[PDB]
Design a binder for this molecule. Structure first.
Ligand SMILES: Nc1ncnc2c1ncn2[C@@H]1O[C@H](COP(=O)(O)OP(=O)(O)O)[C@@H](O)[C@H]1O
Ligand SMILES: Nc1ncnc2c1ncn2[C@@H]1O[C@H](COP(=O)(O)OP(=O)(O)O)[C@@H](O)[C@H]1O
Ligand SMILES: [Mg+2]
Ligand SMILES: [Mg+2]
Ligand SMILES: [N+]
Ligand SMILES: [N+]
Lengths: 234, 239
């Protein structure tokens, strides 16, 4: 059992992680209202509409009626209406779904942000090791399968003490191994700490953040932020 | 009679202008909640808390009990609570108010944005000329009075046909006179068109935008945006 993106992100926020939960809408009219209200706070901003379905590969998927993409850029609230209207009540087809696609009943409306770096981060129980493991790569753009066979220096695997959880030294090293400097190191530490707490305290089978991003705020500060989230349970 | 910033900005938006209306809160608890919810959309953004009072010079004002500023930057939702708690139910003292200040009953919570340029733009009925006039300077940071005597080249005054309203050629020239190029020229034209419609169709005696800004969106697009707004009306006007 997997939970939806927005639910996973809200759970991450509850444990102190930074994640763009946006706001969910169950109608295209409501989606447009969310975007219009957000223009009162950041005039001229763009939007991203994210189909909330239990499946990956949304961005490169397609809809029966012709729309391309399950994660779509929109420049206006009316474009948010148009995009959400093709998602809600319709089926999205991705490589992780059969040709049957999967039904979508709601979308996430997000502000469009500048993404500087994309990381992959997952937390799971590694049966071989017999302990929790934090897996991460500094090349979140490309799949994790390929990364381990086209640039293994960028993939990192961190065994975790089950009883003591991650140590500060482990997380600091992981942040620097991913290429982070300055304030971003401790920012990353805090976020991975929160991601592990979600994993441990929620009895999760997997916490996968793809991508864990370095984004710019509207005033150009660099911060760590979960831009996607998949949390699984048995 | 002047109306509050929140109302002026929403009125400008109704007529197609770009203005940061933010969201109004009547308690510090609500102010915090607005900021926290906004972090779901632009994580890590900063905030600006703006006292809604009928007086200018808020940014440079002070509160009796020690806080400095009526327009204040806040880095977190809890700082928004702290700042708003010192505004709501308290009196702000500015250059335009008396010594005792003026009561503040609500604040605007706004997202912090990068401001590239600040312009002054006003639309009013010039009695001497006997027609509406659009006044603007490319130096909105300094007072319009300072501009007229230390850089008059930056102040522009455009008489408007009362019957036909501003022409596209006047507005294009004004945008270029203010130093704009590229997409910002037409962006400025559209926004000033909207401001004049507010002035004309709402029977206003003054629409003052100080500053009319060039701001960056979160994805670094440059757009025109009203960052302050003062609209006046005359209850005892000539019929
Ligand atoms: N708010 C956003 N602004 C800009 N780009 C975004 C935003 N959120 C996500 N993206 C981009 O969209 C891509 C697809 O989104 P994602 O949530 O990962 O869905 P999926 O992995 O199912 O395709 C991300 O890899 C990221 O590059
Ligand atoms: N959202 C914002 N982000 C950053 N700075 C802002 C924002 N809105 C306004 N400002 C700045 O705050 C200053 C003071 O606010 P303003 O609305 O002009 O009030 P007042 O003129 O009464 O001081 C503005 O001139 C502008 O420089
Ligand atoms: Mg993803
Ligand atoms: Mg002002
Ligand atoms: N940015
Ligand atoms: N910016």
């Amino acid at each position: 059992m997997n939970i939806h993106e927005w639910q996973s992100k809200q759970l991450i926020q509850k444990y102190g992680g930074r994640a763009q939960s946006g706001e969910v809408a169950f109608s295209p009219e409501r989606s447009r209202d969310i975007a219009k209200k957000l223009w009162n706070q950041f005039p001229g901003c763009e939007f991203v509409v994210k189909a909330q379905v239990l499946a990956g590969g949304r961005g490169k998927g397609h809809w029966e009626h012709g729309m391309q993409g399950g994660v779509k850029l929109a420049k206006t609230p009316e474009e948010v209406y148009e995009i959400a209207n093709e998602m809600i009540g319709h089926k999205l087809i991705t490589k992780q779904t059969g040709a049957k696609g999967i039904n979508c009943n709601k979308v996430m409306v997000c502000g469009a942000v500048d993404i500087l770096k994309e990381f992959y981060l997952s937390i799971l129980l590694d049966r071989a090791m017999g302990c929790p493991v934090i897996i991460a790569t500094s090349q979140g753009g490309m799949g994790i399968e390929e990364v381990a066979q086209k640039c293994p220096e960028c993939l990192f695997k961190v065994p975790i003490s089950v009883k003591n959880g991650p140590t500060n030294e482990q997380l600091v090293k992981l942040a620097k191994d991913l290429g982070l400097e300055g304030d971003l190191v401790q920012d990353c530490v805090d976020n991975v700490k929160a991601l592990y707490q979600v994993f441990d305290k929620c009895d999760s089978t997997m916490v996968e953040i793809n991508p864990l991003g370095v984004i710019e705020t509207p005033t150009d500060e660099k911060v760590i932020c979960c831009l996607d989230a998949k949390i699984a349970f048995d």
